Amino acid sequence: MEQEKVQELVSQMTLDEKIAQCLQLSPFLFKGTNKNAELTGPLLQEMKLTDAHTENAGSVLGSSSALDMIGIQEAYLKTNRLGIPLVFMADVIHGYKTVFPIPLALGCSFDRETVRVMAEVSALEATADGHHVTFSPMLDLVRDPRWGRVMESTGEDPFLNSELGKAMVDGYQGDASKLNENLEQMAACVKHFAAYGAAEAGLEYNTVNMSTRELYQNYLPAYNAAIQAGAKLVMTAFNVVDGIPATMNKWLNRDVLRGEMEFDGVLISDWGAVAEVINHGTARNPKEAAQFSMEAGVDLEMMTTCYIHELKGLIEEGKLSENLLDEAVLRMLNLKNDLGLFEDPYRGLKNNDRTKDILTDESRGKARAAGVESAVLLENKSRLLPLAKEAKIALVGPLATSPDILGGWNVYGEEKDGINVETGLREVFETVEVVSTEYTELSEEDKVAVKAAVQNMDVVVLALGEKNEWGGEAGSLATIRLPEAQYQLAKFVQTLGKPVVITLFNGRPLEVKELAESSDALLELWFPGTEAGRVTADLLSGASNPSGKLSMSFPQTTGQIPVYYNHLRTGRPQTPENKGERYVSHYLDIPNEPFYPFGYGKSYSEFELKTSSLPKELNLGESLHVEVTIKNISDIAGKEVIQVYLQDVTASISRPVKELKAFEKVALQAGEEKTVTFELTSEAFSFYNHQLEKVQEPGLHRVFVGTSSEDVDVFEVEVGGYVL
Amino acid sequence: MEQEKVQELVSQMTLDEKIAQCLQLSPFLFKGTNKNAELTGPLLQEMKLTDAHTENAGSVLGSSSALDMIGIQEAYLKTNRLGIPLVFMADVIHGYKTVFPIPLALGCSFDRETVRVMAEVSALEATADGHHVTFSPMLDLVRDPRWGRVMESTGEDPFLNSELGKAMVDGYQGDASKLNENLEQMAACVKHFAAYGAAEAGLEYNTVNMSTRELYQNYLPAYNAAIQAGAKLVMTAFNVVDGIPATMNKWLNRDVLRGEMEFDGVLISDWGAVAEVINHGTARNPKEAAQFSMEAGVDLEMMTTCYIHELKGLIEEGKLSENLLDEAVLRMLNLKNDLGLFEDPYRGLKNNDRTKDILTDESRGKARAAGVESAVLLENKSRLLPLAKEAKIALVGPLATSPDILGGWNVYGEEKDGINVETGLREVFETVEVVSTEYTELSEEDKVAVKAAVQNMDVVVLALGEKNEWGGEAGSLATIRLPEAQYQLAKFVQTLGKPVVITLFNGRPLEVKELAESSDALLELWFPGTEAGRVTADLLSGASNPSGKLSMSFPQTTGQIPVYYNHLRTGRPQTPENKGERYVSHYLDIPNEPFYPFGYGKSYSEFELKTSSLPKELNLGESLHVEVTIKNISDIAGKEVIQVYLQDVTASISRPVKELKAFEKVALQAGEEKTVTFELTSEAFSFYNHQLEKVQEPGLHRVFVGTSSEDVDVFEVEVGGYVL
Ligand SMILES: [Mg+2]
Ligand SMILES: [Mg+2]
């Protein structure tokens, strides 16, 4: 509908209708839900919600199916005075029913098109089941693998996160101006604004603190990239940002998000985040939480009742302008209009059952393809991998038969539909003997069984990993290790005399030195999703060639954290020419380097790269064009991730030793040679200064081209002169 | 001498004289040195120092004795055109020749007079050997025990650190306006400005980043207290402060230190820190490092040559004003004048050998008394301790005979004069059987020997600990544990069936859970210094009753770091009533609490405290007066540390759940009752807001009175109304 009619709606709503429009509730709080209806009465009484509230609520979170949505929307539209339909939002993080790899695994793909496809299939299925918005992409920069929510991020680099974040928004939304027409696409919600990943000591919900300059340099750019790409919603964070809970942080939400970033869509709170500003100690009670969160521009309160019980009295008393409420209501109505809800409240589902679009073979192949792009081969000593299909496999460990391979933040996917590692391997390999063990125990009886299977077979596939419940939200581990029984298993297996490949399933970096050292090969599968066992079997057999690279550093030990590639030099850097000396930046007990670094991953192929002649000088404002020729010099087709880093050698702020500023994943047949070109615009040479200006300073830069943050050639370019 | 004569010297100096005045050198680079002459020739040539340089240098760093100083000062005044004497500075951190407990241990004293006395004895001795300045106190806030320099701080609380920092300054300097007269006192130098202890991942020299608000709230207050108390010098930090190395950080040093804190004394670089701004990537060469460090107001370059080689040219070219150089030279001369050097360049020694004042028995008693104030009794199950004098002791482990008990940052104290554990115990206990073991090994032969000693004796004193080289500067450990052999030893000893006291020597918080669980008693002696074994023997025997309290949190595990008592609440605090829920701030694998908290320590006595009726309301600006009556209800004389904390319940910034605002250590005979009073001024209720204003907000505060951050009675005070 026309914008005039939208605005007219706001004019016609009562104060109570406008207040309720800013409330989001679980489906079973509404009449006409088809699930959990025995929870309805108790919870409504406990939250003190009336019919007047639920019949005028703005939104539903977490509908259970198309039938829930239709049931609820239908009943809601019977009683709603002005006919303003509900918007339905959902947690579609890395797939709906077809589960794709966890986001941190998709980071390791270094593949924008993989991420777009994942988001596209996700939207196709989610919209089929009646959802209009997804709480994705998660764009929090992560440097602390203790935090369980690292599995939701694409990792430690703000550029990679920015690029994959745009890819995701594109896949979910397509052309954002046509979400009223394109009913298999859905709105995206950027989260969590801001800097939630910097939680102190990796403890869930814990304090975040950094300078404003560091906030702008590293923690804000991916949110911004996604917002500029057209993300329809933004979600507040649970953490403080410089002492003020994000949800009621007026500078953050009005000045930065709506002002500098020009965001004009719905700002939704995280779950209970409005009420929880009380717990943080920055509102005395629900009246203050309401006032402060509305002053900060939060339009939609997720499943708490500060707005509903408090806004009327704040507005009647003069403590809050009713204009702020109108602006909130207008953004809610505009989202709904963007989604086409005023013309079709069922968004394409009424008399059009799309059950058929969910969990198709094509979608499944897309998830397998995403898993084989995202896995990272970490060790492969002596061409153990790929295994011949006649290789006799002892498959042992807790991940041998476990169905827990879909990952965390899997709200709708079912383990019954997933492929476990044994099933996967039995499709490819004729001889497999299986010995499952428990995640946290290694019995005498287990060791006898393991010894017997290994003795029978020729190679060991040792499948280890985390339960998905050990990460995700409020899955903080102080010590980033598997259960000790797993490391003891890897040590035991090593003693049996046969080659060992460890296939590792997990949602965070872990201490894997003891694994690498106890095996011949190590393949990091993360959690690949629905097609996990086929992903594993294809990579092991070489049907697919590993091509992922780490998007997050793997520390030597828990106490190295935070460790990350884009770090400052310090006044006393360790150099090859001072190593051994006391008075340099080092630890007494471990290396400075992480166990594996950013951008690292192996392949069954071998590649040679060469960079075309670059200029020695550049003007201010001028781009550097970087041409790279890459040849596959082996007999095995595969993919390499070309990476380009820049360094600012001297600056008015100490700058990182490297920052990723371009990447492309190149597929090459045996012998095949391609040339790829990168433009590093003057923005790539710029940074935030002490006064928080975005600046380019004349001076020396290094340019690094290669295949990890360590395997690079280096070139120097002197920036100066006049500005273009 | 008169100020007009000081100003006149500046007017008369050549530019080359002025530039060299801003240089500090090791003693052996001066003619007249009486040690390390063999080092002089090569080092002069590598630094490209000539006689016009050394005969005009401003200061000496680390003279080895009174004779070195005299020889150096005599030779230099033969050749110095204008007669400007050298100022001699040294590292007197917790004692000169009589070594007191390490600063972290003095923090655990919670005793201002103990710290004052340590600094007084240190000055008595240091001045007797010809030093004019000490590079103490170290006032860096510490929350990360990986960092080896925690041993130099008084811990994680800015209030405690503030109070003991003032006590040290008062102890070294006395009345600072009479340093030309009181030649047994010396100038103090606050260090390291600023925020060096926040080194990321506890890695030496590594990145520091925090919000400006946090910097003011927690990281600057102790430096400020010591500056306000009259500290003569300040030293720059090695780390970046919001991206800019502190040494050339103009905002920090000009605006904050000289402007806001009104510091008008010498700003000395840390070692090489002027040249190292190059390494940090914020100066291209020595010419820029010099410019920027002089613009930031650094007056004295410690052992690098940026100033001496580049200033003349920067001044001649007009890139740098000669006025900044004159200001530096004037501060350097004012310092020398404050020390009386223009009337007596030898500061009391030239006709007065004060060898007599060094390592006196009186001073050794003060060091013992400081050790028994500072140890912390952590466990004492079944009144194992105190031991009777006739107890038959098996003394075993790496600390049974090690002479390494004087601590890190012991530049001048000698182990031959210290008292090891065996020696201390044999002065008190008639029956001691000793079995020494290595710091990092536990052999079969050791076990046989330990088992035999234990079989013969009735109790085990298991003496464990760190080598001092495992901490201090560039002594970072990624895992805060002793060598695994020591934990294996404690496990072994526990099997022998006799009661065990572990006496632990160390410079940082360690993971001690396994030690607490493997023993009946645990006594944290840190490194007590010269009288270490006597301190140990008195506490074990009850001649002294332990009275120390932790000034830094002891983590459950390395991965809990940072953990500290003055933390924010978060949006989802763990409460005793949401125990067991997933969606709260917690770890899956450990408690949120540290193993032991701030302000905890045991005693051989028992106390009861009672707080007198407090007001329910208070005006803004008004003090709260807190009166507490304490009684020793045991038969044993003892000291208890009464602590008072404040919490700001609701604020415009999320405030810590507690902060210490008053403490007093109270000595009580058996059955003795005392009353003490505390004034919490309105400044105790104040904090820095979003705009960096120091404010007091009306509202609810809680007041906590007790004997730890956990063992408290709580009271509520509503603050508002008018301002008083
Ligand atoms: Mg530059
Ligand atoms: Mg308050």
Author numbering:
A (entry chain B), B (entry chain A): 1 to 724
Give sentences copied directly from the paper behind this entry.
In the gene cluster containing the lin1839 gene, the lin1840 gene encodes a putative glycoside hydrolase family (GH) 3 β-glucosidase (BGL) (GenBank accession number: CAC97071.1). The structure showed that Lin1840r forms a dimer of identical subunits each composed of three domains. The active center of Lin1840r is located at the interface of domains 1 and 2 as in the cases of known GH3 BGLs.
The crystal structure of apo wild-type (WT) Lin1840r was determined at 1.8 Å resolution. Lin1840r shows a similar overall structure to that of JMB19063. A loop (amino acids 568–598) in Lin1840r extends into the active site of the other subunit to form a part of the substrate pocket as in the case of the corresponding loop of JMB19063. Therefore, the formation of the dimer is predicted to be important for the catalysis. In domain 1, the N-terminal region of Lin1840r (amino acids 34–53) forms an α helix, whereas it forms a loop in JMB19063 (amino acids 29–48). In domain 2, the helix and loop (amino acids 435–455) extending to the active site in JMB19063 are missing in Lin1840r. In domain 3, clear electron density was observed. The metal ion obviously undergoes six-coordination with the side chain of Asp648, the backbone carbonyl of Thr650, and four water molecules. The two predicted catalytic residues, Asp270 and Glu473, occupy similar positions to the corresponding Asp residues (catalytic nucleophile) and Glu residues (catalytic acid/base), respectively, of the known enzymes. A distance between side chain carboxyl oxygen atoms of Asp270 and Glu473 is approximately 6.0 Å, suggesting that the enzyme follows retaining mechanism.
